[PDB]
Design an enzyme around this catalytic site. Structure first.
Site, mmCIF file in Angstrom:
data_model
loop_
_atom_site.group_PDB
_atom_site.id
_atom_site.type_symbol
_atom_site.label_atom_id
_atom_site.label_comp_id
_atom_site.label_asym_id
_atom_site.label_seq_id
_atom_site.Cartn_x
_atom_site.Cartn_y
_atom_site.Cartn_z
ATOM 1 N N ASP A 1 1.301 1.855 19.869
ATOM 2 C CA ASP A 1 0.993 1.273 18.556
ATOM 3 C C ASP A 1 1.850 1.942 17.496
ATOM 4 O O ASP A 1 2.474 2.978 17.746
ATOM 5 C CB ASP A 1 -0.506 1.542 18.252
ATOM 6 C CG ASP A 1 -1.132 0.701 17.160
ATOM 7 O OD1 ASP A 1 -0.477 -0.202 16.577
ATOM 8 O OD2 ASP A 1 -2.320 0.999 16.885
ATOM 9 N N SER A 2 1.878 1.360 16.300
ATOM 10 C CA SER A 2 2.322 2.082 15.121
ATOM 11 C C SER A 2 1.178 2.949 14.603
ATOM 12 O O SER A 2 0.057 2.891 15.103
ATOM 13 C CB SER A 2 2.881 1.118 14.097
ATOM 14 O OG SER A 2 1.953 0.134 13.695
ATOM 15 N N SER B 1 3.820 2.901 8.096
ATOM 16 C CA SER B 1 3.494 1.841 7.152
ATOM 17 C C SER B 1 4.687 1.404 6.344
ATOM 18 O O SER B 1 5.484 2.247 5.894
ATOM 19 C CB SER B 1 2.398 2.265 6.202
ATOM 20 O OG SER B 1 1.165 2.362 6.877
ATOM 21 N N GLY B 2 4.798 0.094 6.142
ATOM 22 C CA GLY B 2 5.902 -0.448 5.383
ATOM 23 C C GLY B 2 7.129 -0.770 6.204
ATOM 24 O O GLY B 2 7.995 -1.511 5.748
ATOM 25 N N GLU C 1 19.332 6.799 8.119
ATOM 26 C CA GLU C 1 18.651 7.976 8.649
ATOM 27 C C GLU C 1 18.396 7.888 10.133
ATOM 28 O O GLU C 1 18.005 6.845 10.644
ATOM 29 C CB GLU C 1 17.307 8.155 7.976
ATOM 30 C CG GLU C 1 17.371 8.667 6.545
ATOM 31 C CD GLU C 1 17.652 10.144 6.438
ATOM 32 O OE1 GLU C 1 18.138 10.713 7.435
ATOM 33 O OE2 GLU C 1 17.385 10.726 5.372
ATOM 34 N N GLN D 1 -0.077 6.028 11.165
ATOM 35 C CA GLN D 1 0.150 6.583 9.848
ATOM 36 C C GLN D 1 1.589 7.128 9.725
ATOM 37 O O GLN D 1 2.072 7.799 10.626
ATOM 38 C CB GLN D 1 -0.834 7.715 9.606
ATOM 39 C CG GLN D 1 -2.275 7.352 9.213
ATOM 40 C CD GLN D 1 -3.185 6.678 10.252
ATOM 41 O OE1 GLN D 1 -3.889 5.740 9.906
ATOM 42 N NE2 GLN D 1 -3.252 7.193 11.439
ATOM 43 N N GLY D 2 2.257 6.804 8.618
ATOM 44 C CA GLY D 2 3.646 7.153 8.358
ATOM 45 C C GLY D 2 4.637 6.084 8.751
ATOM 46 O O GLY D 2 5.786 6.124 8.320
ATOM 47 N N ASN E 1 17.424 11.663 12.007
ATOM 48 C CA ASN E 1 16.565 12.817 11.720
ATOM 49 C C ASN E 1 16.356 12.901 10.215
ATOM 50 O O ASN E 1 17.325 13.133 9.474
ATOM 51 C CB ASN E 1 17.192 14.102 12.242
ATOM 52 C CG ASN E 1 16.229 15.248 12.219
ATOM 53 O OD1 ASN E 1 15.516 15.428 11.244
ATOM 54 N ND2 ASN E 1 16.142 15.993 13.326
ATOM 55 N N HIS F 1 0.799 -1.195 0.000
ATOM 56 C CA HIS F 1 0.000 0.000 0.000
ATOM 57 C C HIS F 1 0.852 1.274 0.000
ATOM 58 O O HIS F 1 0.323 2.361 -0.193
ATOM 59 C CB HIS F 1 -1.062 -0.003 1.101
ATOM 60 C CG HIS F 1 -0.620 0.468 2.439
ATOM 61 N ND1 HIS F 1 -0.333 -0.367 3.504
ATOM 62 C CD2 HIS F 1 -0.515 1.731 2.913
ATOM 63 C CE1 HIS F 1 -0.058 0.377 4.569
ATOM 64 N NE2 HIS F 1 -0.148 1.653 4.231
ATOM 65 N N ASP G 1 -0.121 -7.489 1.844
ATOM 66 C CA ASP G 1 0.368 -6.115 1.836
ATOM 67 C C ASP G 1 1.890 -6.084 1.958
ATOM 68 O O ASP G 1 2.470 -5.792 3.024
ATOM 69 C CB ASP G 1 -0.305 -5.296 2.943
ATOM 70 C CG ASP G 1 -0.025 -3.801 2.834
ATOM 71 O OD1 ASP G 1 0.469 -3.378 1.764
ATOM 72 O OD2 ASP G 1 -0.358 -3.076 3.808
HETATM 73 CA CA LIG Z 1 19.130 12.628 8.088
#
Ligand SMILES: [Ca+2]
Length: 223
Positions: A171-172, A177-178, A52, A174-175, A54, A40, A84
């Site tokens: 919880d996890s 995901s994946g 990564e 939105q953002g 920040n 998705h 998914d």
């Molecule tokens: Ca960075």
């Protein structure tokens, strides 16, 4: 991630950010050339960002590598979110060292009660919105299939599991995901869906990665 903690820079070395001008999804590095994410999260023009912490500041350990190809699971259903999962190939191999590293695929499925690490740059609030710039982490258990199905009647397939806390608050979101769910050093889940975030009796729902290992391996071997 709601109700989690700041991971610490580069402490989750397989976590990637998918960027299309902005962070939009997580993913997991599974070898120097390939990332696992949620179907998705599919879109064209993905740049994979490794190393990564920040996501808004260049801190010195990043590798930014454009995707050459994406492969959504052949049986992904965007209405039910069954299957998914997608694979993303990098145009060039990532350089691997302790801050940028692949995560192992499972050899067997994890069990309810196992502790896992869920991570991402998604919303940290259950009501309203706040996006972190640094990576957040959450330790959470896999929940029983029966409690998962009772939480989400008619919606949980054999390719999904629930993880988290029925009481709410962690919880996890939105953002996220994946992104990864890692248990005992193996990638067992992909952040997929849930009702809101961190709501009582509405745990996170995750793609069950152990079902996909043969597809992943065969796809990588021919692409
Ligand atoms: Ca960075």
């Amino acid at each position: 991630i709601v109700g989690g903690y700041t991971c610490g820079a580069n402490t989750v070395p397989y976590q990637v950010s998918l960027n299309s001008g902005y962070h939009f999804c997580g993913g997991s590095l599974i070898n120097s050339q390939w990332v696992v994410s949620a179907a998705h999260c599919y879109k064209s023009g993905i740049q994979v960002r490794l190393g990564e912490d920040n996501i808004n500041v260049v801190e010195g350990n990043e590798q930014f590598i454009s995707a050459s190809k994406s492969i959504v699971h052949p049986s992904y259903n965007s209405n039910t979110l069954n299957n998914d999962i997608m694979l993303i190939k990098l145009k060039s191999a990532a350089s691997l060292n302790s801050r940028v590293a692949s995560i192992s695929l499972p050899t067997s499925c994890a069990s309810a009660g196992t502790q896992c690490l869920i991570s991402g740059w998604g919303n940290t609030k259950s009501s309203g919105t706040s996006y972190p710039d640094v990576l957040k982490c959450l330790k959470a258990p896999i929940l029983s299939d029966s409690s998962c199905k009772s939480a989400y009647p008619g919606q949980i397939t054999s390719n999904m599991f629930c993880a988290g806390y029925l009481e709410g608050g962690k919880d996890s979101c939105q953002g996220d995901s994946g992104g990864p769910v890692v248990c005992s050093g193996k990638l067992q889940g992909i952040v997929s869906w849930g009702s809101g975030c961190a709501q009582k009796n509405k745990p996170g729902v995750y793609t069950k990665v152990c079902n996909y290992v043969s597809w992943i391996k065969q796809t990588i071997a021919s692409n």
